[PDB]
Amino acid sequence: ALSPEQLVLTLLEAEPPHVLISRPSAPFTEASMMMSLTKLADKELVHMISWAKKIPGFVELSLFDQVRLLESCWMEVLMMGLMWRSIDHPGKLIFAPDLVLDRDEGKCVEGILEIFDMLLATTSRFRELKLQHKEYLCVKAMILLNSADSSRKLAHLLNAVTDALVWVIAKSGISSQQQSMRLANLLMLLSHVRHASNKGMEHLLNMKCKNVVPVYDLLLEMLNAHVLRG
């Protein structure tokens, strides 16, 4: 039972810290770029779990629901983050402050370029809409949450975060109609993010089985998504 203004601040406080990784000394190859990505991701996944647990009410869901939600949305959340980080840097993908990939660098890994392009396209769209930080916080949480006691609780949590986004938009002062248009515009983009994550997951699974990159521990568990698949 918390107001939207209060939930936004809570989300702000829950934001994961920046993961610092750097380009390898030697130039990139398919294998080393992928390696860097998996190393970055494993650290980010750890942070994602901590973030999730700071979302009011999340830990009250069934453990089964908590696992399924994270297993289904993780790549999408990682991508949403990457989009935010890259928002003011056209043509670039800011995976990490010191790991900034240029679009063309996608050529280093077979089939990643078209996905990078998808990523840059959606990022461009968010930039043109002038996505605000607080809006991003709400949307990111929305991605996790939109992915009987526990069901009831989840629906309530999704509603809370939705209400927060509505609140954030309303403080901009624009007309009711433009507020609605903005909201729709943002949510509509979300399907583009989901799409990118679907292609990213497919691609990553390929990279793994083509033994281009080794996938272990937390990343592997989440990628396999055994609990989610049942």
């Binding site: 901590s50 994270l70 521990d217 568990e221």
Partner: peptide, 8 residues
């Protein structure tokens, strides 16, 4: 481990 981390 995702399990350990959530149960934590």
């Amino acid at each position: 481990s995702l399990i350990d981390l959530l149960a934590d």
